[PDB]
């Protein structure tokens, strides 16, 4: 795969949930610290791991198709994005369904 999100510093590939929690814990547990990872079993799905109030939460991002166009969503199509970059860039400024903004790339 050569999707654009693979060029981003917040994208960490196929790391596990426990791994993402250790990585975020090692980097300060600061609010808004986040990464995006591939789901270990969902075809083309992703997980947003996010730190808020010293607790790491995980938000499933699933693909879907509307007519012939693909989009990603964390809320069953209430809010849709063409790619993970658009989703991340939106949530750096807007909380949406998240408890806080995406502030610092975990890397």
């Amino acid at each position: 795969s050569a999707a654009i999100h693979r060029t981003q510093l917040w994208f960490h590939g196929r790391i596990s949930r426990e791994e993402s929690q250790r990585l975020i814990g090692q980097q300060g547990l600061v609010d808004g610290l986040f990464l995006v990872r591939e789901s270990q079993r969902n075809p083309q799905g992703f997980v947003l791991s996010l730190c808020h109030l010293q607790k790491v939460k995980h938000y499933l991002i699933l693909p879907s198709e509307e007519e012939g166009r693909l989009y990603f969503s964390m809320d069953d199509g209430q809010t849709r994005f063409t790619d993970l970059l658009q989703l991340v860039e939106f949530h750096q400024l807007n909380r949406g369904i998240l408890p806080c903004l995406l502030r610092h790339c975990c890397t």
Partner: peptide
């Protein structure tokens, strides 16, 4: 909602 995840 998605079981095992924090989506709401």
């Amino acid at each position: 909602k998605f079981e095992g995840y924090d989506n709401e």
